[model samples]
Target: RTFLHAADVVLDPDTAHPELFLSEDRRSVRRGPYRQRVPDNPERFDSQPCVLGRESFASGKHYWEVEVENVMVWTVGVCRHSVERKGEVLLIPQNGFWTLEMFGNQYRALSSPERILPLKESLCRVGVFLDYEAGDVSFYNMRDRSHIYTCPRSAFTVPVRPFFRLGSDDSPIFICPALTGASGVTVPEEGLKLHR
Candidate 1:
């Protein structure tokens, strides 16, 4: 099995909804018990309890992993740099969002028209890979190193950033740290190349 090197992602508290609480270390985020007063900024998410990563990708291939251990519902993917941060918005590829989501026991890919896929196994962690030049975004079941889904032929006109949304107040999502050479057997550099 090949293991791709993960990216370093930290949640941006300023862009998070007022009701979302970020860990002090900025590696995890979850819905807060109650909404708190916060500045209404254009960068903050107004409707959904979501947050964007501090890093944005304009080029190259990037990979990251997220731990969704006790999360019952969550969304993870990449979105255009200009994604709407105010009001309620549909999370679809047409709206510049390419994400894979889990609601209860259902798993879905939030694509152009959306799709509900079958999952024979449960996932504890997920791996996300984005190839800006290739216009591809893919997900994987990190535990088994199995393919999950991919949004191919994406039209990324601008820079994109890692996006995340939590489901419940008790469910927290953690961004996995970058993997080191000692972490596991690394995938060959050629294997890391994404193909459309």
Candidate 2:
């Protein structure tokens, strides 16, 4: 509870690409046929299949989890509200986007100079933590709760919101609700999954 879901974010449909299908709650998204025929808005991504969250951050750190096991390719991170949405733009820091992208099962950070991310296996759930004070965006593997990588130099001048990109695949990516533990102590089992 203290980790993920520190900020409850929903996909902002107005800013979503036409081909992307956002759930009713706006907590999940999927790649549909490129013919939804949505209106042409300045905030919408016409070329890229990306979406921004409704909530924006000007200060403080916010953490959230997304179930991305079935996702063949995707990008998740934070970006400012003024990023280019009409024209094609690079998903790099210079372009107001910083993300850990998985394409062809290879993970890489969308930094100024794209950085490769080291991971043992595919992640069932990926946790994204944005730290404004620390000037960092951290990615975690929730299956083991291990560090994936951190974008250590975030120069956020304006408000930053959750930036998500959906690559090919009908696999719906679900934003996980916060994990609230039981009131009483519970027994641990199996190999044990610790959130430390």
| Residue 79 lDDT (model 2) | 92
Assess candidate 1 and give its lDDT. 0.85
lDDT of 2 by residue, 77-158 (tens): 8998999998778988888897988887688888333477667798788889888766788888988889898876877888
Compose the digit string of candidate 1's lDDT tens values, residues 12-64: 88889988888999999888788878888889999988899999998888889
* Candidate 2 TM-score over all chains jointly: 0.85
Residue 100, model 2: lDDT of: 87
How large an RMSD does model 2 have? Answer: 5.8
In candidate 2, the residue pairs with backbone N, CA or C atoms under 3 Å apart (3 or more residues apart, or in different chains) clash, namely: none
lDDT of each: 0.85, 0.83
> Residue 153, candidate 1: how far off, in angstroms?
1.5
Tell me each candidate's RMSD, in Å, in order: 7.7, 5.8
What is candidate 2's local distance difference test score?
0.83
